Design a protein around this nucleic acid. Structure first.
Ligand SMILES: Nc1ccn([C@H]2CC[C@@H](COP(=O)(O)OP(=O)(O)OP(=O)(O)O)O2)c(=O)n1
Ligand SMILES: [Mg+2]
Ligand SMILES: [Mg+2]
Ligand code: NA
Length: 348
DNA sequence: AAAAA
DNA sequence: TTTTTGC
DNA sequence: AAAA
């Protein structure tokens, strides 16, 4: 009776996944295609996984898949196999593949992506111990921090830790911009209990162009002085008012145990901060809330269904030849002709 | 890999 | 068939 | 170039 859209932005996806048996398998197959640089097959498995996550019931027969989009012949074979024996032979083969195991292990290090993981694999490396102890290898500053704080960063971040970080961010930010609005974005805004990092959007209604530019530098220098800044990379803005990203920083912060309301006495935490102009705060909030799949389908829907162009800074209508303004996420959804999807419903 | 053009 | 897939 |  319910006509499920192929777009994540036209579906409500909450964290209660009734099809984790199927989506864990589809996520593994997608990840393998990402590694094999098969972008098309990767995206097809990510879309199939995304739609199953939106279902209000578990798939228990092939009849249950009728009318569900993004499930082509290959994906239906995978679902059929899992219904048969409770296992995916396809995903099991990927989990036993040497290239796949190496890519997962290597990219688990902060600062190591697809290119460096592929380089290390082709050199014959298979373990992190052999990589770290090699005397010929050269590591980026990001990778050095990734190896030094590996156990802390791989253990992830819980809600009490995220809240403790939010307090630190807000305390530091109001010191330099007292009327600044600090919003936790990412997974935690979508209601997640855990995350690999804690993300924040910072905006100020009265700050000048220079004040807006200096905030991330002032806040990180303050933490550097305290000895809390374990890693810092500030990317200056490439945002153009009339046209690429907002001023942002990728950090590793020292989170003292005493600050967490839930050994060494502290934990290394990945933190990302984004500063945007006040008038673009709704576009940035929408972009940074995610999920990744929700954002990509929002942009795809805007292009293919509305002839509009959406990004973290603006919304442009190609037919009316006008930029559309928004003071809230609700106004962006209304401009696109979409029913409002709450942040906890964007877990596509 | 799936859906559209 | 070719093109697109956040771009 | 590469990591986000
Ligand atoms: N390819 C991406 C990656 C991220 N984002 C946006 C939406 C999510 C937000 C945060 O990026 P992440 O921190 O990796 O997202 P996450 O949702 O918070 O998940 P986690 O932080 O647990 O790794 O940035 C996006 O539009 N496209
Ligand atoms: Mg995050
Ligand atoms: Mg992040
Ligand atoms: Na990494």
């Amino acid at each position: 009776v319910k006509k499920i859209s192929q777009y994540a932005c036209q579906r409500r996806t909450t964290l209660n996944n009734y099809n984790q048996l199927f989506t864990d398998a589809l996520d593994i197959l997608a990840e393998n295609d990402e590694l094999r640089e098969n972008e098309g097959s990767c995206l097809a498995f990510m879309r199939a996984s995304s739609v199953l996550k939106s279902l209000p019931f578990p798939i228990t027969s092939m009849k249950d898949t009728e009318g569900i989009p993004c499930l082509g012949d290959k994906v239906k074979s995978i679902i059929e196999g899992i219904i048969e024996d409770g296992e995916s032979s396809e995903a099991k083969a990927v989990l036993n593949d040497e290239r796949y195991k190496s890519f997962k292990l290597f990219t688990s290090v902060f600062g190591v992506g697809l290119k460096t993981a592929e380089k290390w694999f082709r050199m014959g490396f298979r373990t992190l111990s052999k990589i770290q102890s090699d005397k010929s290898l050269r590591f980026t500053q990001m990778q050095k921090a990734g190896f030094l704080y590996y156990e802390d960063l791989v253990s992830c971040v819980n809600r009490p830790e995220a809240e403790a970080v939010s307090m630190l961010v807000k305390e530091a930010v109001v010191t330099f911009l007292p009327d600044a609005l600090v919003t936790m974005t990412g997974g935690f805004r979508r209601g997640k209990m855990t995350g690999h990092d804690v993300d924040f959007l910072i905006t100020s209604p009265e700050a000048t162009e220079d004040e807006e530019q200096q905030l991330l530098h002032k806040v990180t220098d303050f933490w550097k002085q305290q000895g809390l800044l374990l890693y810092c990379d500030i990317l200056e803005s490439t945002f153009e008012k009339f046209k690429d990203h907002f001023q942002k920083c990728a950090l590793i912060l020292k989170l003292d145990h005493g600050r967490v309301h839930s050994g060494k006495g502290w934990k290394a935490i990945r933190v990302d901060l984004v500063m945007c102009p006040y008038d673009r705060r709704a576009f940035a909030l929408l972009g940074w809330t995610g999920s990744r799949q929700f954002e990509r389908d929002l942009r795809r829907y805007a292009t293919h269904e509305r002839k509009m162009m959406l990004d973290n800074h603006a919304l442009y209508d190609r037919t009316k030849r006008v930029f559309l303004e928004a003071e809230s996420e609700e106004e962006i959804f209304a401009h696109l002709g979409l029913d409002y999807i709450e942040p906890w419903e964007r877990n596509a």
